[PDB]
Design a protein around this ligand. Structure first.
Ligand SMILES: CCCCCCCCCCCCCCCCCC(=O)OC[C@H](COP(=O)([O-])OCC(O)COP(=O)([O-])OC[C@@H](COC(=O)CCCCCCCCCCCCCCCCC)OC(=O)CCCCCCCCCCCCCCCCC)OC(=O)CCCCCCCCCCCCCCCCC
Ligand SMILES: CCCCCCCCCCCCCCCCCC(=O)OC[C@H](COP(=O)(O)OCCN)OC(=O)CCCCCCCCCCCCCCCCC
Ligand SMILES: CCCCCCCCCCCCCCCCCC(=O)OC[C@H](COP(=O)(O)OCCN)OC(=O)CCCCCCCCCCCCCCCCC
Ligand SMILES: CCCCCCCCCCCCO[C@@H]1O[C@H](CO)[C@@H](O[C@H]2O[C@H](CO)[C@@H](O)[C@H](O)[C@H]2O)[C@H](O)[C@H]1O
Ligand SMILES: CCCCCCCCCCCCO[C@@H]1O[C@H](CO)[C@@H](O[C@H]2O[C@H](CO)[C@@H](O)[C@H](O)[C@H]2O)[C@H](O)[C@H]1O
Ligand SMILES: CCCCCCCCCCCCO[C@@H]1O[C@H](CO)[C@@H](O[C@H]2O[C@H](CO)[C@@H](O)[C@H](O)[C@H]2O)[C@H](O)[C@H]1O
Lengths: 120, 172, 56, 110, 113, 155, 102, 86, 459, 80, 67, 110
């Protein structure tokens, strides 16, 4: 995306480092952040034998989808609703990461301006 | 070269047309450029200065080399073709039938009765064939590989067996 | 476990049977290619059963 | 891939057989109507190969391409893969265009 | 036209060979002589090949000469490869032996040798 | 066969250079030994280092597959020049030009791949976030050693 | 550039023999003289190529392979919340109520 | 493939020649010499042999092709290569 | 071992008192019966070897070599009885006597407890082998081959005699069971460096080691078929068997004295494999393939690991059956065209379809296609050699590539392509020839079902 | 046994081979092999489809059965 | 055999092969249209891609620079 | 004429592939690995009288045994470091220093 052109051809200082993100404190500019809430418990995911890369903050929708898939056999076209709930939760989880990237980008810009405003 | 000047020109013409066909693909397009290529050969058809004609051939061969198709069309059974030698594994020499077990030969009583007439014809003709090649060859042995015909009724052309009884091109 | 393990192995064993009747002299060479084709078509059916159990 | 790639080879084998072991696409052409069923299989197989939506090839190729260009990945590799995807449609057109379309270019005894 | 540049694994085409076109009775005579030698050998082979009573192998002196020539001289690269490979392997094993002494080589599950 | 018909030592005089050519079924003008460097070639003829693929396909060879005639001298490296092995037939592109182009393509590709590794493509997305201290226990962590906590926050 | 009359005559003579040799390759009616000697077909095939093989394999696995430790190893069944265990009758609790985000 | 016959080959050889503008179909016979009786040159004969290679889908090497100087000789050549005896 | 020695000796009266036309039938039938009883040597225990008497003992190293030896005798008789058809009757009975006496020396060689008794029989095998090559070889060069065979062996054997005798003076016994308990370490010194060379160089020449191998291609090109079968199948393995025994008393000096010989073997196997690509003689090609295969055995013995000895034992058995089969296959071609040139007779799959199957199977084992015991032996040596030094995988990998190249080259050159027009005496394969090939391949493939019985004492 | 089509029927008129004759006739040339190629532009071999026309083979019938299906589908709901 | 070859002419076609080819070409197109009518998201896009330039600083917790 | 042999080879060609797919240890997997190489060699060189077919068949073996160098390397490494060829034990031990074994597998796949 454009974000790559900016980093590799423009100013790499005010572009987030994908490997080292985040770099500011979690609560810098956020009064009273809440923690993410996890529905499914560790045992439930252990029992359902979810792949570890699937044991994220959307696992309860995946476990709901997997159970319906097993009960609907052989109607492999059932469960379209459960599948979507899982996809949508994973979509919101993705937008959150985009927000974190943008927040890091804007903080890196503020830090830059706060210097030139300070340099003089 | 053992080829004459005519042979070199005609070989180039055929080869040039075949590579042109590979470039053109479409028949109407090939017909058009096949006529232009013929016209170039017709322009110099009547050149009499053989040094000049040899130059024209030399320059045409450099033109062909530059403009040849890197992957020209080859007939499937021609050398380098996709079917070349594909059936050689099925060609069994006729002498293999001599080692057939009697029970195998008894399945084709008629074929093996005819086969013995050929082996008889071959044995009785061999001496005349050898003699003919002796009386026709000059001292020092032959100078070319051309073989003579039979010069007499009842005679067979010398060295015919492996020509006549060679395997069929589709032997199975 | 019984059906799954048993039908997964007949699939492999079924395909070797035409090889046995060949390399051991016990079949009818009249239409061996049809026989070998039939074994594949039947081995496909058997293999599908363990696949359905895995999918389910 | 095992489906449409195997079909494509059987489709070429059908043409090669009908044209007495000719394998060069330059001596084919004009087979769209002469070989109706081979033509249909050769067009279905080519659209699957090139990722026509909802054919067998679309359910892997497109998932693979979108996962490649949204991944943390070598940028040159990502570009070569995409240009190659375009090439897949080109030589796919060569087979259809030269084997099926146009006028016959094969020998006279049909 | 860029001119052909022959190599060991890419000979010059005959149609591009200047020697292929310039011809003098010496070359034509030389070609006739070769065709004479070939035709004499061909006849000698054909008289035995076509003989109805011959069952066996027509021994070829040229094939006998070839095998004899190339199976005659033997000398099985002297110490250079052996010395080279010696230094590669000795250095590797000395390097590895030292680590095992110091416990710096990982052999946690190595119990097959 | 007989000794006089078998290969012998390097042919010194022009008369020995004539008995060799006769022995090998060659014109005395065409016959040439290998250089007398004591490599063991003896008087075997040095023949042009051309592949058998380069011979005429349409001629009626005594051995069609080898493209050889009975009695003609065999090249020293003939087993290396059979049609299944080394080919020397003329190429439509000059050898040196081919080597440049193939090397140029590969060298360009390896360089551009290194460039592509130094400036990777990626999406404008923060790190994926996992629950339970980045799944410390599931990933095989020691159940005894309470890990450094990882806390993720809503955004 | 064509055949010399001597070449034509040889080609003609070889051709006569060849076409006669090719004619003699044909089989007479009695040759080869051989020495004296869909449901149903598919049902025997199933019997001999599926049922008998699976009888032998099931016998082999049940009374030999599965009687040794760890010869057949299953991935244990997945247990989802709300399921019931056949062996013990235990009931797995459900997952706590979701945010019900949609 | 369909088998070839001596008259089948002859008919297709004369068919190609009749479709050649430089020949007069009424004067064309199996025994008509291309250079003597039909007044063609050796550049034409090259093209006739190529049209025969295209007709029957196989190649006639230049050494043999140069010697085929009437329709009957082409028929004899083709019949020999494909084991036609009819 | 008397139950094997005595019946083997009885084969001599049987041949000599047999009716004039029953020499091949009687010797073949009863030598096969002896091979049958040889399976009783498989009474092997986990801890203790099978020790019959003060003179003879049998462990899991010697047992498969004994069974291979007694199996090879009937096979040698079948392979020889055609080219000896015109031989004088009394000269037939003398040829069979040389083979029987070779078996006698071999079975006692592999079971002698003491190393001097092993040495005497190890050397006695020369006399019959020399006589077979020189008396019943075919060409002029069989006399030179006998001399190179004799003097290459003795130039190494005589120092070994001195070394063995010196060991008995210092240790007090050469009994192998006794040496297992009285073995003392060998310290650095020039006296020990030459004791190590004396103990090992006789066995190196037999393997043969690369550099000291040039006698072997001579012997093979000149020996009669039976000579080539025993020479390749068993006599080469005398050197390997002796090494696996005598290295017991050479530690730890083997740690550094092995370096020159591992480099010769590792590089020598690549060189000899590449030579096979340019051989014109089918027998010489198969000869040079043995040098390449036995290079692996030398390396395996010298690195002294449980996996390497297991691989070494399997190769010696696997190679023995494969190399003997290849020689028989080439000989069957030779008996028709009377030439060993590989390029002379081509496209033989067209004319001898079933013999092309044997050619294919022999080639597939020769290149070590899994799960043949040819590969089980090769793989174990590669596994252990990797742990010796990781770089060896490069040489090992290259050799496998080249090994497949000339194995299939030989198959393609002789069996495929177009047949040779003027060779018209290729008769249908005889029942004797077909049975001869099957009696090689069938045991070789059967052993993949129970490979433990050929893995040796460290299994 | 095989009967060949009458040779007089092959003509370059009305085919691209005729355009070639006009294109050559400008330069003073002639194609003497034109009629040997004519059969390729006549009869069932004339009027071959375009690439798009080839890809859209069966679309007419496929689209119709599609309308009859979504029509059937949207009717099985209106009742429900 | 039962399809007699023709010289320089369009080949003989059976009615079975023409219909089967046409039937399976319609099955393909029917399938594509039927799948596109229900699964257009698989081709165009499952979810709306957000525009990160519209997110307020209050959403992303960017404190004012004066601070 | 050898159609019966051809179907026997296609069947062996398939069996060795199914041994490869279901193999649960590296040695059993190697049996199928080399098995398809031989069956490929015997089926490419089907028309064995043709020199080009013999050359192509041997070319397939040559390039495939260059890859098999990497296969043996992975086998040698896994036995030395993890004491196993079984896939279960390889994944349970999950070695971190897996560059050498995987380069071997990558070369084999190449
Ligand atoms: C207890 C002790 C009991 C004694 C042992 C009993 C077993 C021996 C039985 C011998 C009798 C067999 C018989 O009667 O002949 C029938 C059998 C079939 O008759 P045929 O087809 O007319 O033979 C003529 C040609 O030779 C036909 O040649 P072909 O080419 O058509 O087939 C012959 C075949 C040779 O035989 C086979 O390979 C059989 C196929 C393998 C299974 O060669 C091949 O097919 C080459 C392919 C090799 C495949 C390797 C690929 C890797 C697979 C590795 C997987 C390992 C799994 C374990 O005869 C043979 O083919 C000869 C084979 C004899 C050796 C067996 C080798 C097995 C390997
Ligand atoms: C990612 C990692 C990349 C690593 C790859 C590096 C190596 C790539 C190159 C592989 C070796 C190249 C040689 C291949 C030769 C070959 O394929 O044989 C075919 C050859 C001619 O065949 P062809 O040109 O296809 O067509 C003939 C039509 N007349 O016919 C022949 O001549 C073959 C028969 C002779 C056999 C010669 C083989 C000699 C050994 C060379 C191969 C390598 C040996 C092992 C060493 C490499 C292993 C590290
Ligand atoms: C060849 C013949 C011509 C050349 C003469 C041979 C002798 C020259 C080579 C040197 C041999 C080394 C040697 O001389 O050993 C002497 C050493 C004496 O030590 P010692 O007195 O016993 O000390 C008290 C311990 N009891 O002895 C010992 O301590 C033990 C030595 C064991 C016996 C070694 C036998 C000599 C081996 C020499 C050849 C070895 C290489 C073989 C090459 C074969 C090539 C095919
Ligand atoms: C979508 C495709 C993406 C991948 C594209 C990859 C592009 C790779 C380009 C590699 C080109 C390398 O090839 C390069 O070409 C020129 C032109 O012949 C060569 O040069 C050669 O031709 C010219 C003369 O005609 C001269 O430079 C020189 O006499 C000669 O050596 C270079 O020696 C060679 O290095
Ligand atoms: C195929 C041929 C292979 C040839 C391999 C050659 C191996 C070379 C081995 C070198 C070591 C020989 O053995 C070496 O001998 C002397 C005994 O005099 C020992 O050394 C001892 O005597 C020497 C006398 O010069 C003193 O210097 C030394 O103080 C003393 O310890 C060494 O500790 C020992 O290492
Ligand atoms: C799962 C969904 C399945 C959907 C299936 C839909 C039904 C498929 C009907 C296939 C009809 C096959 O029948 C075929 O149709 C085509 C097109 O009309 C006709 O083709 C028509 O146009 C061509 C070109 O002008 C003419 O050559 C032909 O004479 C003419 O009838 C064929 O004459 C007819 O044989």
């Amino acid at each position: 995306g454009a974000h790559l052109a900016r980093r590799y051809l423009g100013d790499a200082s005010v572009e987030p480092d994908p490997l080292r993100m985040p770099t500011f404190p979690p609560d810098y500019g956020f009064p009273e952040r809440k923690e993410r809430e996890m529905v499914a418990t560790q045992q439930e995911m252990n029992d359902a034998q979810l792949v570890l890369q699937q044991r994220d903050y959307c696992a309860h929708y995946l476990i709901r989808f997997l159970k319906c898939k097993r009960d609907s056999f052989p109607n492999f076209l059932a469960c379209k609703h459960e599948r979507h709930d899982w996809d949508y939760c994973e979509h919101l989880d993705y937008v959150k990461r985009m927000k974190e990237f943008e927040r890091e980008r804007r903080l890196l810009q503020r830090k830059k301006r706060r210097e030139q405003r300070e340099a003089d | 070269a053992y080829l004459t000047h005519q042979q070199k020109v005609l070989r180039l013409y055929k080869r040039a047309l075949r590579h042109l066909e590979s470039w053109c693909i479409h028949r109407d397009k090939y017909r058009y450029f096949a006529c232009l290529l013929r016209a170039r050969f017709d322009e110099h058809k009547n050149e009499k200065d053989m040094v000049k004609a040899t130059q024209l051939l030399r320059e045409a061969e450099e033109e062909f080399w530059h403009g040849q198709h890197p992957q020209p069309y080859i007939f499937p059974e021609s050398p380098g073709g996709t079917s070349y030698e594909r059936y050689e594994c099925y060609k069994v020499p006729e002498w293999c039938l001599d080692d057939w077990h009697p029970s195998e030969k008894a399945m084709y009583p008629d074929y093996f009765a005819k086969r013995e007439q050929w082996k008889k014809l071959r044995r009785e003709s061999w001496e005349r064939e050898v003699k003919q090649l002796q009386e026709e060859t000059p001292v020092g042995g032959p100078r070319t590989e051309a073989l003579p015909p039979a010069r007499k009724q009842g005679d067979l052309p010398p060295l015919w067996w492996h020509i006549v009884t060679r395997p069929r091109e589709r032997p199975m | 476990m019984n059906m799954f393990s048993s039908l997964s192995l007949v699939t492999l064993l079924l395909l070797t049977m035409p090889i046995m009747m060949m390399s051991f002299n016990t079949y009818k060479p009249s239409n061996y290619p049809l026989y070998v084709k039939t074994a594949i078509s039947y081995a496909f059916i058997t293999s599908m059963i363990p696949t359905m159990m895995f999918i389910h | 891939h095992a489906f449409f790639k195997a079909m494509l080879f059987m489709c070429s084998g059908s043409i090669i057989h009908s044209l007495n072991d000719e394998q060069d696409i330059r001596k084919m052409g004009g087979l769209f109507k002469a070989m109706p069923f081979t033509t249909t299989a050769l067009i279905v197989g080519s659209l699957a190969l090139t990722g026509m939506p909802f054919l067998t090839g679309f359910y892997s190729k497109d998932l693979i391409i979108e996962a490649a260009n949204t991944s943390y990945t070598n940028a040159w590799a990502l570009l070569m893969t995409l240009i190659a995807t375009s090439f897949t449609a080109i030589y796919s057109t060569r087979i259809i265009f030269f084997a099926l379309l146009g006028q016959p270019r094969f020998p006279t005894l049909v | 036209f860029p001119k052909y540049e022959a190599s060991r694994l890419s000979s010059l085409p005959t149609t591009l060979d200047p020697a292929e076109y310039d011809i003098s009775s010496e070359t034509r005579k030389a070609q006739a002589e070769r065709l004479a030698i070939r035709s004499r050998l061909k006849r000698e082979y054909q008289l035995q090949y076509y003989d109805p009573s011959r069952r066996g192998v027509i021994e070829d002196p040229a094939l006998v000469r070839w095998t004899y020539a190339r199976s005659a001289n033997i000398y099985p690269f002297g110490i250079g490869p052996l010395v080279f490979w010696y230094y590669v392997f000795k250095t590797d094993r000395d390097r590895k032996e030292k680590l095992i002494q110091e416990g710096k080589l990982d052999r946690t599950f190595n119990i097959s040798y | 066969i007989t000794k006089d018909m078998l290969p012998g030592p390097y042919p010194k005089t022009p008369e020995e250079r004539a008995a060799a050519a006769k022995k090998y079924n060659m014109r005395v003008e065409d016959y040439e030994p290998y250089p007398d460097d004591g490599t063991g070639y003896g008087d075997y003829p040095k023949l042009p280092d051309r592949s058998q693929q380069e011979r005429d396909p349409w001629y009626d060879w005594d051995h069609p597959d080898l493209r050889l005639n009975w009695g003609e001298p065999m090249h020293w490296d003939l087993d290396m020049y059979i049609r299944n092995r080394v080919d020397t037939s003329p190429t439509p592109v000059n050898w040196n030009l081919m080597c440049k182009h193939l090397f140029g393509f590969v060298a360009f590709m390896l360089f551009m791949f290194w460039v592509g590794e130094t400036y990777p493509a990626y999406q404008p997305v923060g790190p994926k976030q996992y629950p339970y201290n980045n799944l410390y226990l599931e990933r095989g962590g020691d159940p005894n050693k309470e890990p450094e906590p990882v806390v993720h926050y809503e955004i | 550039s064509g055949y010399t009359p001597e070449e034509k005559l040889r080609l003609q003579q070889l051709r006569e023999l060849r076409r006669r040799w090719l004619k003699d390759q044909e089989l007479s009616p009695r040759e080869p003289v051989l020495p004296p000697q869909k449901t149903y077909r598919h049902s025997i095939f199933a019997f001999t190529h599926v049922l008998i093989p699976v009888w032998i394999i099931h016998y082999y696995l049940k009374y030999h392979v599965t009687t040794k430790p760890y010869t057949i190893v299953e991935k244990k069944p997945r247990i989802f919340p709300g399921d019931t265990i056949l062996e013990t009758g235990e009931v797995i609790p459900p997952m706590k109520e979701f945010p019900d985000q949609h | 493939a369909p088998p070839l016959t001596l008259e089948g080959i002859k008919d297709r050889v004369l068919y190609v020649l009749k479709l050649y503008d430089k020949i007069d179909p009424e004067k064309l016979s199996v025994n008509s010499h291309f250079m003597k009786d039909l007044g063609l040159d050796s550049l034409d004969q090259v093209e006739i042999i190529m049209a025969m290679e295209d007709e029957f889908g196989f190649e006639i090497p230049d050494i043999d092709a140069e010697k085929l100087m009437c329709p009957q000789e082409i028929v004899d050549y083709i019949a020999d290569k494909k084991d036609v005896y009819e | 071992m008397l139950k094997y020695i005595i019946p083997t000796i009885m084969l001599m009266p049987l041949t000599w008192l047999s009716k004039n036309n029953m020499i091949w039938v009687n010797s073949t039938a009863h030598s096969l019966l002896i091979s049958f009883t040889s399976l009783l040597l498989m009474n092997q225990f986990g801890d203790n070897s099978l020790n019959f008497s003060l003179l003879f003992f049998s462990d899991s190293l010697s047992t498969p070599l004994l069974i291979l030896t007694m199996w090879l005798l009937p096979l040698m008789l079948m392979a020889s009885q055609h080219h000896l058809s015109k031989e004088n009757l009394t000269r037939k009975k003398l040829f069979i006597t040389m083979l029987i006496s070779l078996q006698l020396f071999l079975i006692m060689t592999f079971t002698a407890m003491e190393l001097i008794l092993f040495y005497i029989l190890f050397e006695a095998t020369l006399v019959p082998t020399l006589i077979i090559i020189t008396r019943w070889g075919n060409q002029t060069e069989r006399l030179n081959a006998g001399l190179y065979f004799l003097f290459y062996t003795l130039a190494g054997s005589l120092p070994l005699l001195v070394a063995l005798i010196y060991i008995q003076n210092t240790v007090g016994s050469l009994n192998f069971l006794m040496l297992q308990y009285w073995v003392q370490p060998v310290h650095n010194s020039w006296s020990n460096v030459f004791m190590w060379l004396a103990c090992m160089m006789a066995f190196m020449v037999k393997m043969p080691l690369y550099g000291l191998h040039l006698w072997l291609p001579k012997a093979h090109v000149e020996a009669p078929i039976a000579g080539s079968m025993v020479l390749a199948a068993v006599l080469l393995k005398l050197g390997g068997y002796g090494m696996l025994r005598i290295t017991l008393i050479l530690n730890p000096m083997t740690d550094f004295m092995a370096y020159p010989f591992i480099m010769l073997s590792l590089w020598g196997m690549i060189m000899t494999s590449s030579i096979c690509l340019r051989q014109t003689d089918l027998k010489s090609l198969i000869a040079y393939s043995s040098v390449s295969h036995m290079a692996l055995v030398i390396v395996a013995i010298l690195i002294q690991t449980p996996w390497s000895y297991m691989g070494a034992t399997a190769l010696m058995i696997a190679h023995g059956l494969t190399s003997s089969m290849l020689f028989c296959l080439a000989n069957s071609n030779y008996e028709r065209i009377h030439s060993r040139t590989m390029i002379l007779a081509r496209g033989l799959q067209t004319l001898l379809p079933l013999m092309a199957t044997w050619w294919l199977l022999a080639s597939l084992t020769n290149l070590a296609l899994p799960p043949t015991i040819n590969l089980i032996g090769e793989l174990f040596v590669v596994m252990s050699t990797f742990s010796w030094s990781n770089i060896t995988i490069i040489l090992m990998g290259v050799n496998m590539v080249i090994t497949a190249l000339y194995s299939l080259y030989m198959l393609i050159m002789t069996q495929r392509g177009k047949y040779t027009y003027h060779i018209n005496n290729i008769s249908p394969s005889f029942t004797r020839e077909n049975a001869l090939m099957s009696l090689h391949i069938l045991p070789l493939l059967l052993l993949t079902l129970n490979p433990k019985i050929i893995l040796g004492p460290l299994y | 046994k095989m009967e060949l089509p009458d040779y007089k029927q092959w003509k370059i008129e009305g085919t691209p081979l005729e355009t070639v004759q006009e294109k050559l006739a400008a330069r003073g040339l002639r194609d003497p092999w034109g009629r040997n190629e004519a059969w390729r532009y006549m009869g069932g071999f004339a009027n071959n489809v375009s690439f798009v026309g080839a890809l859209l083979k069966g679309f007419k019938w496929g689209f119709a059965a599609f309308v009859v299906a979504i029509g059937a589908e949207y009717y099985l709901e209106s009742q429900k | 055999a039962h399809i007699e070859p023709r010289y320089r002419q369009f080949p003989q076609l059976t009615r079975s092969q023409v219909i089967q080819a046409e039937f399976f070409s319609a099955t393909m197109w029917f399938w594509i249209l039927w799948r596109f009518w229900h699964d257009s998201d698989a081709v165009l896009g499952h979810f709306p891609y957000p525009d990160p330039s519209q997110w307020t600083d209050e959403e992303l917790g960017i404190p004012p620079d004066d601070e | 004429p050898n159609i019966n042999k051809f179907f026997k080879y296609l069947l062996l060609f398939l069996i060795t592939m199914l041994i490869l797919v279901t193999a649960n240890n590296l040695f059993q997997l190697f049996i199928g690995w080399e098995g398809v190489g031989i069956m490929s060699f015997l089926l490419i060189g089907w028309w064995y009288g043709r020199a080009d077919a013999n050359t192509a068949a041997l070319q397939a073996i040559l390039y495939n045994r260059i890859g098999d160098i990497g296969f043996i390397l992975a086998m040698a490494w896994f036995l030395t470091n993890l004491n196993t060829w079984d896939l279960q034990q390889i994944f349970m031990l999950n070695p971190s220093d897996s560059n050498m074994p995987l380069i071997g597998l990558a070369l084999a796949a190449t």
